[PDB]
Amino acid sequence: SPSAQELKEQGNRLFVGRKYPEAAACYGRAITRNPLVAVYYTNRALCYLKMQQHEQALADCRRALELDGQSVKAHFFLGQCQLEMESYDEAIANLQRAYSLAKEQRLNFGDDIPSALRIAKKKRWNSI
Numbered sequence: 446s447p448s449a450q451e452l453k454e455q456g457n458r459l460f461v462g463r464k465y466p467e468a469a470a471c472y473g474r475a476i477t478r479n480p481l482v483a484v485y486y487t488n489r490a491l492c493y494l495k496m497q498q499h500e501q502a503l504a505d506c507r508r509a510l511e512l513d514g515q516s517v518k519a520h521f522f523l524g525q526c527q528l529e530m531e532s533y534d535e536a537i538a539n540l541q542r543a544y545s546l547a548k549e550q551r552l553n554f555g556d557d558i559p560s561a562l563r564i565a566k567k568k569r570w571n572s573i
C-alpha cells in the first residue's frame with residue numbers, strides 16, 4: 446500500500462520524532478519495495494547508531510556505498526559509527542572523505558565535518 450518513497454519519508458519523520466526502532470523498520474519496508482536506493486540504507490544506519498547497534502550500522506553504510514560510492518552521508522555516518530567503535534584511523538579517513546566529497550558536490554554543512562574531524566582526532570590522540 447505505501448510506496449518506497451512514502452516509507453522513507455515516514456522513516457525520516459519518525460527519526461526527527463526520536464522513534465528510532467520504528468524509523469528503522471520504515472526504512473526496512475522501503476528497502477523491501479526498492480533495495481537499490483542508497484539513502485534508505487544511510488538513514489537506517491543512523492537509526493542503528495542511535496540504537497547502539499554498531500555492527501548493523503556499519504553493514505548498512507557498506508550497502509549504501511556499493512550503491513552510491515560518492516555518498517557524503519554514507520562516509521560521514523560510517524566515520525561517526527567507527528569513532529564510537531574506537532576504530533579511529535578508519536573514522537578519520539571516512540570523515541576526511543566526507544569533507545572532500547562535500548566540497549566537490551558544493552554541499553554546505555557549516556563547520557560540521559571539520560568539527561567531527563577535530564573530535565575524532567582529539568579522541569584518537571587521548572587514546573594514544
Ligand SMILES: O=C(NN1C(=O)N[C@H](C2CCCCC2)C1=O)c1c[nH]c2c(F)c(F)c(F)c(F)c12
Binds near residue numbers: 457458518522557
Ligand atoms: O544528517 C545530518 N543532519 N540531519 C539530522 O541530524 N537529522 C536529519 C536526518 C533525517 C532522517 C535520518 C537521516 C538524517 C538530517 O539530515 C547531517 C548533519 N551534518 C552532516 C554532515 F556534516 C554530513 F557530512 C552529512 F553527510 C550529514 F548527513 C549531516
